[PDB]
Every structure is written in structure tokens, then in C-alpha cells.
Amino acid sequence: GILDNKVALVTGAGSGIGLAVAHSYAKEGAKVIVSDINEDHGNKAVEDIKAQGGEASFVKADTSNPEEVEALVKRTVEIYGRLDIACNNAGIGGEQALAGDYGLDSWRKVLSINLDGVFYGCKYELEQMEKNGGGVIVNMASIHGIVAAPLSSAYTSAKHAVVGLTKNIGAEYGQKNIRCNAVGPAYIETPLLESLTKEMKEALISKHPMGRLGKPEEVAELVLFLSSEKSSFMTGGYYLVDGGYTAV
Amino acid sequence: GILDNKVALVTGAGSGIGLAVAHSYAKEGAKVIVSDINEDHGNKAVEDIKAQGGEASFVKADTSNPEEVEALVKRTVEIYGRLDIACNNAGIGGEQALAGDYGLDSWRKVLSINLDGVFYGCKYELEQMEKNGGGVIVNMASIHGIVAAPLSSAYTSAKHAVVGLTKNIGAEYGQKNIRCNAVGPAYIETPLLESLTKEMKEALISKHPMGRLGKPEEVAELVLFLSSEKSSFMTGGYYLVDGGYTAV
Amino acid sequence: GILDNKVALVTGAGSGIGLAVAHSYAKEGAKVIVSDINEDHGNKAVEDIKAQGGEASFVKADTSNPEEVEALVKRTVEIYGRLDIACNNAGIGGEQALAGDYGLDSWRKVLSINLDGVFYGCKYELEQMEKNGGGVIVNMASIHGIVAAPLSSAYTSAKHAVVGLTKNIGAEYGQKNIRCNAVGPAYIEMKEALISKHPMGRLGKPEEVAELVLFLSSEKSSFMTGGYYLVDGGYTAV
Amino acid sequence: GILDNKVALVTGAGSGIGLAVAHSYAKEGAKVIVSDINEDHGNKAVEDIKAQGGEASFVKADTSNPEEVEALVKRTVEIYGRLDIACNNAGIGGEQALAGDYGLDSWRKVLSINLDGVFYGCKYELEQMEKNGGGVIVNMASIHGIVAAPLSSAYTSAKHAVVGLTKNIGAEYGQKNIRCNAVGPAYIETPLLESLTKEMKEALISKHPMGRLGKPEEVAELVLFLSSEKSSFMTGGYYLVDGGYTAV
Ligand SMILES: NC(=O)c1ccc[n+]([C@@H]2O[C@H](COP(=O)([O-])OP(=O)(O)OC[C@H]3O[C@@H](n4cnc5c(N)ncnc54)[C@H](O)[C@@H]3O)[C@@H](O)[C@H]2O)c1
Ligand SMILES: NC(=O)c1ccc[n+]([C@@H]2O[C@H](COP(=O)([O-])OP(=O)(O)OC[C@H]3O[C@@H](n4cnc5c(N)ncnc54)[C@H](O)[C@@H]3O)[C@@H](O)[C@H]2O)c1
Ligand SMILES: NC(=O)c1ccc[n+]([C@@H]2O[C@H](COP(=O)([O-])OP(=O)(O)OC[C@H]3O[C@@H](n4cnc5c(N)ncnc54)[C@H](O)[C@@H]3O)[C@@H](O)[C@H]2O)c1
């Protein structure tokens, strides 16, 4: 596989996009640390990866806690000896409210996971990668890293911040054998959108020129490309996988 | 004046861009609440505004404290009866370090002032504006809301987030008689930059096609335009005042 | 007036945004060359401007013809002595058709006016501004300088190109006392479907675009160059 | 091969990025039409592709001539029966002059190849793709589709236009089983750059945070990804391969 013997960390890997990324990494021969805040999801993800013949291990972490993220990177090295690839994917949507109505608690929570947790991951991933010859980071952003999501101002602000952080890391580490890029999915059909009525999902779909929502596997293909040596001249960039959402 | 008898709040108005904005607002007839964490600076700004024929009052606030931001808007209404215009300007540059070396507390300090304080301002400003017929908000971002500042990842992340928040508020409040836009200055001549060597200053100027740094009054002219009725069809937007910095 | 004793040129000034720009320039004291391909609309614009107390003169030009644009700048200097400000505004919508269906000549016609005419204006305006101490250019782009307009691919391509041209002029002339910026209006007066794409819940008015052009043409915008400036009612925020 | 049973067209394929794209397509099983104005370059490219085990045929075309582009697609169908993938890559650099000094013929020439030729390609490619059930187009843009290249205003204008055309095609054809995306390379090491001195190339490399120029194969990897089913939810987008150039 194209990631043979690389060690890869994925946060939020118990479901959705992160689960598809963990599967993709493992299918291409990486040794994958599956991290999630939910141990049942994380353990099941690992068992499913191994059932297809891949190599994976579970490590629990809440990415909003910098101590836990630091320990997660240390545990990755303890288990597999190094860190070559990291995908900072864990995130939450937050409450839906007008900005003037937005709860202080929901603002803090969304920014703590979707931004601070990505920074903590990058921080400790970068420190380990400088010890084993470099590596590659993919940050999960969103279309809402470049356009608004009305009623989700904390999410939009955090995802914009992830785009900026990614530009900074790419520029700073360009000559340190480390690359960092961000992925911007549009709306992806996962059990998270379960509560939407058919009419609500049809309204969402109408905002995608391709006439459907995306699949987690289609995001994971882009993450895999950006994590592999095929993307060797790509750093600091933001890469849409949006069905045309932001083209209009 | 083009803001005659509008009530306008400026945070961080004791120095630099914020001071120039407060003077510009007052020159155009606004009743200005000068807010700053430094009472000496804020009271001096009010005195200088009054000596040039304008109207202003000082209210102390730390924008990283949401109770103090809510109280700042309340005090504005106690003094001048309403809130028509707000410029969320207060910010800090932060420590300079590679992302992997960036301090945990340093990261949170930059985000708390440069992003959370802007959100707190917008939240309590919007609350009041809905009570008195609408209003206009200008958020101070940076060129580093759209391009990296190597060694300043927290600042870049915060300023990117301000751009996203601005898009969200503009979209959400478009039919609520409220507008919100962001300004993106490049490097501006202030005493903050007088510590740089001859070498460092010339290198910074070399990144601006106009061949010089900007002046605070030049930023304030754009803030003034975006705070006035002349910008009546402009909302959710990001507006450079950058000497060409991001054109290349 | 904030443009007192400046000489300003506006293309496509017989109607719509260009007419509002010419009025705004003249109200602020500029001597305005109203240019349009339609003599009747341009002469009427000049008469309305003078009726308001301003100074204006008409010069006909087809901006798709580079010789006529060069002559337009020459006539500006013959009439008012110099050129301080130029707004490259003349444009056309073009046929509505899928990109694969778009006519070859229809494509070129939209690009010739909406891009080549803006370049010809910039070229000869820059030439003159370098003789009289610099100046300021505003290029009329569109929201479709940064997002697609389905069935109008030629227009979208042309307006994207105007944004890039503007970045290049701003960068090139930064130390030559010349600034150049681009304005990006959304839709300016079913209209219901169109209005639903604007968060402000209405279309824009030409005077609202003109206020931004005036700001970018004045000394108030003195540290602004190479930039793209939306006046879009929130259209591109989502 | 991930392009088994596909037919792919590449313009400007006798050298540089286009040659690398043609090789990458052929390596993955596509039947490749190599097009170029230079018959010696194009026939040699085909010779090299076949020596690597691939399938390819040469067709001469000047992309600024719409009749030749129409004939190029017609000949592709005559040789291989269908058209699945097209990379519109042929381009020129243009006169180096200030915008006010730029030649009228120089402007026309750059736009005729770098924009009109891309449009002609898309037009006749889309026409055939509609006849055989869909397809994928990749348009070669540049970093100068989003940032200036001083002294190359025509190039920057044209490449910006290609980004806009790509957004339009992606949005218009989203439900017609056609995707269209643009690639934005920074400066790539090819014989084209041998006219620069030791000093000029060092200055050019200093504008890339990765500390080197790109290789044509690194661009071709992104083109291949965007041409394959791996990018199935990606359309209308612009994708940098820039070594960090536009991150700052
Ligand atoms: N429509 C979409 O799904 C969509 C659109 C754009 C971007 N994204 C981004 O994609 C990423 C994944 O989204 P998804 O829809 O696949 O989510 P999901 O809810 O399907 O899976 C996310 C996982 O993250 C886990 N998680 C949450 N907080 C965590 C923490 N602190 N540490 C570890 N694990 C944690 C959850 O338990 C869950 O297993 C997020 O960053 C999201 O914002 C998703
Ligand atoms: N080169 C530049 O100066 C530059 C460039 C781009 C953007 N900006 C942005 O412009 C804004 C002002 O920058 P400046 O250089 O004029 O700053 P400055 O330091 O000259 O003035 C900023 C003011 O903010 C006040 N302040 C700091 N923390 C505060 C808090 N928590 N609550 C309230 N007030 C607080 C300070 O006391 C000071 O009076 C900031 O948002 C900054 O990031 C400045
Ligand atoms: N909804 C909108 O109206 C809208 C939105 C975004 C951008 N724009 C841009 O604003 C500009 C003006 O729009 P408007 O609404 O004022 O248009 P309008 O049709 O009201 O006026 C345009 C003027 O341009 C003139 N003109 C056309 N071709 C010309 C040529 N070759 N040489 C000289 N003059 C020529 C016309 O005769 C007319 O007087 C155009 O560039 C347009 O693309 C308009």
C-alpha cells in the first residue's frame, strides 16, 4: 500500500469521516491509532479495521484537553515507535442559534474542540514528527472554513481558524520535512444528519450542485491523497470536497 | 458629519487604530464611547476628542471578560441612550514561536482577546441593536485573516475566525437592519513596531507593494466608511487596507 | 468636494452603475468625462449632471476597440488637461447558455467588452497617469469575479480576469503613485429567486455601488490597492 | 490501473507538466491522446509512453484555434472511440512588461491560448462527454489564478479566468456525471526556467516556503487524482500544488 509501515493517528475515528479515514489509512498499510472520546465506538472501529486485515489500536482522548492530546501522541510512539501521519478530525457541530443569541457555553465548547483541539494535536504531532524525520498533517476543516453556516457561528469561526492555522504550519515547516493541509467537506451523509426531515435534507441537497450529499469515503480519499507522498509539493493549502457548494 | 448623533462604541480605543477610529467617528458627529483596558489612555483619548470639538465618554472594559463587555454595552445605553455603531478593535499580537513551540497559555490568551472578545462584543452589541432599530458592526481582522503570519499562528487563527464570524453575522442579520463587516489592515506604523531593527523594518516594508507601512488614520477611513450609511449594501464582507500585501 | 479639481473618466456612464458613478464623481467636484457607446444616453447623462451643478463632457467610445479607448484618454486630456481617476465600468451580460453550448463568437464578445475593454482602459489610463503625477483606477468586477453565474460562463470568466488584472496593476504600480482596486456588486436593480440569494433580502441600487467606487477613487482609500471589494448584500458570505 | 478503459486527452503534452500528466494517465491504464503544437515533442512523448507499456497516440493542435480543438476531440473519438478525461494544459508565459506598457498583440495572444484555448477545449470535450455518459476535466490554472505575477498581467488575468470558468462548469454540470476542477501549480522545475540566473532562481525559490521548486510529476499526481473516481465528490474547485507560495 501507499502508506506501508507509516504510523498514522486519527482523532474522532469512531464514526463518520474519521472512521473512513482510519479504514483508508489501514487499507494502504499504515499502522493506525484510532482515537475517540467514545471507547465503544473506538474499539469497534479498531476491530473492524483488523477484520479487513489491517493494523490498528485504540487510544481514548478528549482533544479539548491538551494533556490528553500530548499523552495520545506519546502513546502512539509507545505502541508503534514513531508518528508519520496525523488527521485532526474530531469535532462537534454546536447549538443552532443566531449569533446574538449564542450561548457562552456553546461558543466555548465548539471553539475548544474544533480549534483548540486541532491546535493541541498539531502542536504535539509536530514535536514528535521533528524527532522522526518529518511527517504529514491533515486538518479537518469544512466548507464553513470559507463560507458562513447561518445559526452556527461558533462552528464557522472555528473552521475558519483551522484554515489559518494550516496556512501557518505549512509556511513555518516547509523546510522541516513536514507538510500540513486542510480538507473542506460540504455536507456528508452520516448518522449525524439523522434528525433532519426529508424536506430539510432536500433543502441541504439543493445547496450542492452535484445534487446529493457526499459520502465519508469520498472525504477519506482526499485525506489519503494529502497524507501520502503523492501530494509531496502540497502544503499550507485548503482542499474542497464539496460537490460544488462553494463554486456558487 | 456623516455619523451625526449616532452612538458609536470603540474597543481598544486608547491607542493605535482604535484611537484613530474613535477620532474619526467623533469628527463625523458620533457620540463615542471610548473603551480601553487602560484608564489613562482611555481618559486621555476622550479629552483629546472633546478638545477637537467632538463628543465622547470613557468606559473601561477587558474584552476577554464577557461580563465586562455586556456591562460596556449597558453603560453605553445609560450614557447615550442607544447603540448604533460598534467597532470591535481591541487585540494583542501574542508571543512569536513556531506552532510546535507555541505556549498553551499564550495560545489561549491570543484567542481570548482577538476572537472571544470580538464574539462577546458582537453578541451584546447585536442584543442592543435589535432593541433600537438596528445598527452597524465593524470587526477588526488583519491581512492575517486570509494569509499566514509565520511565528504567529494563534493570531492568524484568531483573525481567520473573526472573518468567519463576520460572514455569519452578516448573513444572519441581513433582514434585521444590521450590517457587519471586517477590515483587514496590513502592517501599520505604531510604537509597537519601533522596537524593530533597521533591517527588520525594511524587510517588513518590502512585503508591501506600496513601499511603506500603513497609517492608523488610513485604517480608520475604511472603518468609517463601513460604519456609515454609504456602505448600505455591504455586509458579511472582508475589506483589505493592506498596501497590496495580499495581492501577491 | 472630496474630488475637487480632479479629472475623472467613467466608461458605460450612460446608465445604471456607470451613470451613478459619474453623478457621484461630479457631486464631489470632479470634472467628469462621461463615456458610453450610446451618444444619446451619454449626452443625457452630461445634461443631468450639469443640471445638478457639476462639470461633465461626453466622449463616445466602444471599449472593445483599443484605438477608441486610447482616443478616449486623449480626448479627456484635451478637454480637462489631465486624468486623475478612471472607472472601467462598461460591460454586457451576454447570452445565457451552458458552457458546452456557448457560442464561439458570443464567448469572445463578452470577453472583449468585459475584460479586454477594461485592460485597454487600464493601459491607456496608466500611460496618462504616469505623466500627470499618478492617479486611481477602479475596475468594475462582480460577485462573479469570485463565484460562478450558471449559464453565464463567459461573464464569470471575464470578471474573474478583471480581479486578477486589478491585483497585478496594484502590485506593479504600488510605488508609482497609482492605485487600482476592483468592486464586486451583486445583482443591482424571477426576481424572487434572485432576491433569495441575497441575505439582505433585496437587490442593490446603483447609488450603493457608486458610494463604494467614490470611496475607492478618493484619498480616503490611500492605503488600499490591488484589492477586491464586495458590495453584494451578503451574497458571497454563504 | 485506476483509469482502465478510460480515454484521456492532454493538451501541451510534449513537455513539462503536460508530458508528466500524459505519462501518469498512461501508467494508470488510460488510452492517451497526446496533443501539442510541436510534432517532434508530441511524437517523442508517445514513443516514451509506449516504451513504458502504455497506450497513446499523437494529434497536433493549436488550442487557440477552435476548429483544431474540435478536430482534436473528433480525432480522439476516431482513434479510441470515446472521451472520458481531458486535461487542458497548453499555455504560454507572455510578454514581461508593466500593464501600462503591455502590447496589445501580447495581451491578445496570452488570452487566446491561456483562456480561449481552455474554453474551446472544455466546449468540445463537454460535447463528447455528453455523448458517452459523462467525464472529468482538469483545467491547468496557476498560483496566478489567485495572486498577482508582476509584469505578467495577461497571464494572471487569463489564469484567474480559468478558475472562474472551472467554477461555472462544475456548477452547471454537477448532475450530468461531469466534473471539472482546476490545478494551481507554483513554479515548476522544467527547461523553461533555464533562462534564469543563479540569483534569479534563488529569489524565486525564496518565495516558496518548501525551499525548492516543484517537479512536473508532483503536479501530475494531483491531476491524476482529480481525473480519477477517487475525487468523486470534488467539482468546481481550485486545488493548489504550490509548496506554500500562497499561504503567506
Ligand atoms: N456534514 C458533515 O458531516 C461535515 C461537513 C463538514 C465538515 N465536517 C467535519 O468533519 C469532521 C468529522 O465529522 P463527522 O460528520 O464525520 O462526525 P461524526 O459525529 O460522524 O464523528 C465524529 C466523531 O468525533 C468524536 N469526538 C467528538 N469529540 C471528540 C474528542 N474531543 N476527541 C475524540 N473524539 C471526539 C465523536 O464521538 C464521533 O465519533 C468534523 O471536524 C466535522 O466538523 C463534517
Ligand atoms: N500592524 C498593526 O497594528 C495591525 C495590523 C493588522 C491588524 N491589526 C489589528 O488592529 C487592532 C488594533 O491594533 P493596534 O496595532 O492599533 O493596537 P494597539 O496595541 O496600538 O492598541 C490596542 C488597544 O487594545 C487595548 N486592549 C488590549 N487588550 C484589551 C482587552 N482585553 N480589552 C480591551 N482593550 C484591550 C490596549 O490597551 C490598546 O489600547 C487589533 O485587533 C490588531 O490585531 C493591527
Ligand atoms: N446587476 C448588475 O447590474 C450588475 C451586477 C454586478 C456587476 N455589474 C457590472 O456593472 C457594470 C455596469 O452595470 P450596469 O447595471 O450599470 O449596466 P447598464 O446596462 O445599466 O449600463 C451599462 C452601460 O455600458 C454601456 N456600454 C456597453 N458596452 C460598451 C462598450 N463597449 N463601450 C462603452 N460603453 C459600453 C452601455 O451602453 C450602458 O450605458 C458592468 O460592468 C456590469 O457587468 C452590474
DSSP assignment of D50-62, as one string?
Answer: HHTT-EEEEEE--
C-alpha cell at B228: 456609515
- Number of B/D CB contacts below 8 angstroms equals 12
Q: Of all atoms in ligand 1, which is nearest to the CA of residue A117? A: 31
Question: Read out DSSP for A69-115?
Answer: HHHHHHHHHHHHS---EEEE--------B-GGG--HHHHHHHHIIII
Q: Name the 3-class secondary structure at A138.
A: strand
Instruction: Round to whole Å and give the CA distance between D100 and D96.
Output: 12
Return the CATH number of C1-238, one of 3.40.50.720, 3.40.50.1000, 3.30.420.40, 3.20.20.80: 3.40.50.720
Q: Name the 3-class secondary structure at D14.
A: coil
Q: Give D61 to chain A, closest Cα distance, Å.
A: 30
Q: Name the 3-class secondary structure at A4.
A: coil
Q: Which residue type occupies C4?
A: D
Strand partners, A233: none
Q: Name the 3-class secondary structure at C221.
A: helix
Residues sharing a CB contact under 8 Å with residue A194, sequence separation 6 or more, in sequence order: none
Residues sharing a CB contact under 8 Å with residue D94, sequence separation 6 or more, in sequence order: D106, D109, D110, D114, D152, D154, D155
Ligand nearest to the CA of A193: 1
| Interchain contact, A122 vs B100, CB within 8 Å | yes
Q: DSSP letter at B56?
A: E
Angle between helical axes of C66-80 and C117-129 (0-180°, round to 10): 40
Q: Which residue type occupies D230?
A: K
Strands C55-60 and C31-36: parallel
Helix or strand holding residue A60 (H, E): strand A55-60
Q: DSSP letter at D113?
A: I
Is C84:C135 a contact under the CB 8 Å cutoff? Answer: yes
Is A31:A76 a contact under the CB 8 Å cutoff? Answer: no
Instruction: Round to whole Å and give the CA distance between A161 and C159.
Output: 29
C-alpha cell at C215: 470611496
Question: Read out DSSP for B124-185?
Answer: HHHHHHHHTT-EEEEEE--GGGTS--TTBHHHHHHHHHHHHHHHHHHHHTTTTTEEEEEEEE
What is the set of active-site residues of D?
Answer: 155
* Number of residues assigned to chain C: 238
Instruction: Round to whole Å and give the CA distance between B13 and B30.
Output: 14
Q: How many CB atoms lie within 10 A of CB B198?
A: 7
Residues sharing a CB contact under 8 Å with residue C88, sequence separation 6 or more, in sequence order: C11, C63, C117, C118, C121, C122, C125, C137, C138, C139, C140
Radius of gyration of chain C (CA): 17
CB nearest A153 (choices: B98, B104, B168): B168
* Number of residues assigned to chain B: 248
Q: How many CB atoms lie within 10 A of CB A79?
A: 12
C189-195 contacts, C-beta under 8 A, 24 or more apart:
none
C-alpha cell at A11: 482523532
Expressed in percent and rounded to 5, the helix, strand and coil fractions of chain B are 50, 15, 35
Q: How many CB atoms lie within 10 A of CB B86?
A: 30
Instruction: Round to whole Å and give the CA distance between B244 and B48.
Output: 32
Instruction: Round to whole Å and give the CA distance between D174 and D172.
Output: 6
Edge-first strand listing for the sheet containing B7-10: B55-60, B31-36, B7-10, B85-88, B135-140, B178-185, B238-241
The fold adopted by the segment(s) D1-248 is Rossmann fold (3.40.50)
Instruction: Round to whole Å and give the CA distance between D180 and C99.
Output: 12
Q: Name the 3-class secondary structure at A227.
A: helix
CA dihedral over B65, B69, B74, B78, signed as positive or negative: positive
C48-53 contacts, C-beta under 8 A, 24 or more apart:
C48/C23, C49/C22, C49/C23, C52/C23, C52/C26, C52/C27, C53/C27
Radius of gyration of chain D (CA): 17
Instruction: Round to whole Å and give the CA distance between B235 and C45.
Output: 30
Q: Is the CB of residue A5 below 6 angstroms from any atom belonging to ligand 1?
A: no
Strand partners, B224: none
Q: Is the CB of residue B113 below 6 angstroms from any atom belonging to ligand 2?
A: yes
Strand partners, D7: D31
Q: Is A155 a catalytic residue?
A: yes
Tell me the longest C-alpha to C-alpha distance in chain C.
50
Query: Could you tell me the end-to-end alpha-carbon distance of chain A, in angstroms, rounded to an integer?
Result: 37
User: Which residues of B46-148 form beta strands (DSSP E)?
Assistant: 55-60, 85-88, 135-140
Is B180:B129 a contact under the CB 8 Å cutoff? Answer: no
Phi, psi of B7, rounded to the nearest 5 degrees = -95, 120
Residues sharing a CB contact under 8 Å with residue D233, sequence separation 6 or more, in sequence order: A186, A210, A214, A215, A218, A219, A241, A242, A243
- Return the exposure string of A191-227: e unless at least 16 CB atoms fall within 10 Å of the residue's CB, then b: eeeeeeeeeeeeebeebbbbeebbbbbbbbbbbbbbb
Is C121:C64 a contact under the CB 8 Å cutoff? Answer: no
Instruction: Round to whole Å and give the CA distance between C98 and C100.
Output: 5
Instruction: Round to whole Å and give the CA distance between A67 and D65.
Output: 63
Strand partners, A185: A241
Instruction: Round to whole Å and give the CA distance between D222 and D241.
Output: 8
Strands C135-140 and C85-88: parallel
Is D42:D15 a contact under the CB 8 Å cutoff? Answer: no
| Pick from A107, A68, D116: nearest CA to B118 | A107
User: Which residues of C107-237 form beta strands (DSSP E)?
Assistant: 135-140, 178-185, 228-231
Resolution in A: 1.6
Instruction: Round to whole Å and give the CA distance between A32 and A53.
Output: 12
Among candidate residues B80, B120, B155, B239, the one labeled active-site is B155
Instruction: Round to whole Å and give the CA distance between B11 and B59.
Output: 9
Separation of CA C17 and ligand 3 centre (Å) = 7
Strand partners, B86: B9, B137
Instruction: Round to whole Å and give the CA distance between A88 and A162.
Output: 10
Instruction: Round to whole Å and give the CA distance between D156 and C139.
Output: 15
Is B49:B23 a contact under the CB 8 Å cutoff? Answer: yes
C-alpha cell at B53: 470639538
Helix or strand holding residue A127 (H, E): helix A117-129
Domain spans in chain C, listed from the N-terminal domain onward: 1-238
Whole-Å CA distances, C60 to A225, C80, C115 = 55, 16, 19
Query: Could you tell me the end-to-end alpha-carbon distance of chain D, in angstroms, rounded to an integer?
Result: 37
Phi, psi of B135, rounded to the nearest 5 degrees = 165, -175
Could you give the angle at the alpha carbon of C79 between the alpha carbons of C73 and C82, nearest 5°?
Answer: 55
- Return the exposure string of C74-112: e unless at least 16 CB atoms fall within 10 Å of the residue's CB, then b: ebbeeebebbbbbbbbbbbebbebbbbbbeeeebbbbbb
- Return the exposure string of D58-80: e unless at least 16 CB atoms fall within 10 Å of the residue's CB, then b: bbbbbbbebebbbbbbebbeeeb
| Pick from A117, A94, A118: nearest CA to A107 | A94
- Return the exposure string of B70-84: e unless at least 16 CB atoms fall within 10 Å of the residue's CB, then b: bbbbebbeeebebbb
Edge-first strand listing for the sheet containing A135-140: A55-60, A31-36, A7-10, A85-88, A135-140, A178-185, A238-241
Q: Name the 3-class secondary structure at C182.
A: strand
Instruction: Round to whole Å and give the CA distance between B86 and B232.
Output: 16
Q: Give A158 to chain C, closest Cα distance, Å.
A: 16
Phi, psi of D185, rounded to the nearest 5 degrees = -75, 150
Residue C50, CB half-sphere, CA atoms under 13 Å: how many? 11
Q: Give A15 to chain B, closest Cα distance, Å.
A: 26
Residues sharing a CB contact under 8 Å with residue A74, sequence separation 6 or more, in sequence order: A124
Ligand nearest to the CA of A120: 1
Instruction: Round to whole Å and give the CA distance between D81 and D75.
Output: 9
Q: Name the 3-class secondary structure at B100.
A: helix
Separation of CA C129 and ligand 3 centre (Å) = 24
Q: DSSP letter at C115?
A: I
CB nearest B247 (choices: C171, C201, C231): C171
**In Å, how far from its chain's centre is CA A7?**
16
Helix or strand holding residue A179 (H, E): strand A178-185
Best residue in A24, A190, A210 for a mutation probing chain D (most D CBs within 10 Å): A210
A94 torsion bin: left (phi>0), alpha (psi -120 to 50), beta (else): left
Instruction: Round to whole Å and give the CA distance between D130 and D119.
Output: 16
Ligand nearest to the CA of A44: 1
C-alpha cell at B90: 481591541
Whole-Å CA distances, B1 to B4, B224, C1, C235 = 5, 11, 14, 30
Residues sharing a CB contact under 8 Å with residue B119, sequence separation 6 or more, in sequence order: A99, A102, A107, A153, A157, B165
Is A220:A8 a contact under the CB 8 Å cutoff? Answer: no
Radius of gyration of chain A (CA): 17
**In Å, how far from its chain's centre is CA A104?**
25
Q: Of all atoms in ligand 2, which is nearest to the CA of residue B219? A: 10
Instruction: Round to whole Å and give the CA distance between C9 and C172.
Output: 22
Instruction: Round to whole Å and give the CA distance between C18 and C44.
Output: 13
| Pick from C171, C148, C169, C168: nearest CA to C158 | C148
Phi, psi of D197, rounded to the nearest 5 degrees = -75, 165
| Pick from B175, D158, D148, B178: nearest CA to C227 | D148
Q: How many CB atoms lie within 10 A of CB C54?
A: 21
Instruction: Round to whole Å and give the CA distance between C174 and D46.
Output: 47
Whole-Å CA distances, C133 to C5, C56, C78, C85, C177 = 14, 22, 17, 12, 7
Residues of chain B in Cβ contact (below 8 Å) with chain D: 147-148, 150, 246-248
C-alpha cell at D102: 503591455
Residues sharing a CB contact under 8 Å with residue B61, sequence separation 6 or more, in sequence order: B11, B35, B36, B37, B68, B69, B71, B72
Strands C7-10 and C85-88: parallel
Expressed in percent and rounded to 5, the helix, strand and coil fractions of chain C are 50, 20, 35
Instruction: Round to whole Å and give the CA distance between D167 and B98.
Output: 36
Residue B111, classified by CB atoms within 10 Å of its CB into exposed (0-12), middle (13-18) or buried (19+), is: buried
| Interchain contact, D164 vs C170, CB within 8 Å | no
Residues sharing a CB contact under 8 Å with residue C170, sequence separation 6 or more, in sequence order: B209, B244, B247, C179, C180, C181, C225, C226, C227, D148
Peptide-bond breaks in chain C following residues (C–N over 2.5 A) = 189
Q: Is the CB of residue B91 below 6 angstroms from any atom belonging to ligand 2?
A: yes
Q: Is the CB of residue B13 below 6 angstroms from any atom belonging to ligand 2?
A: no
Is C168:C160 a contact under the CB 8 Å cutoff? Answer: no
Separation of CA A185 and ligand 1 centre (Å) = 11
Q: Is the CB of residue A121 below 6 angstroms from any atom belonging to ligand 1?
A: no
Residues sharing a CB contact under 8 Å with residue C76, sequence separation 6 or more, in sequence order: C7, C9, C33, C59, C83, C128
Helices (H), A173-243: 198-205, 216-227
Phi, psi of D117, rounded to the nearest 5 degrees = -65, -35
Instruction: Round to whole Å and give the CA distance between B147 and B168.
Output: 20
Strand partners, A179: A136
Q: Which residue type occupies D81?
A: G
Could you give the angle at the alpha carbon of D82 between the alpha carbons of D81 and D87, nearest 5°?
Answer: 130
Q: Give residue for cell 526556467.
A: D193
Is D119:D67 a contact under the CB 8 Å cutoff? Answer: no
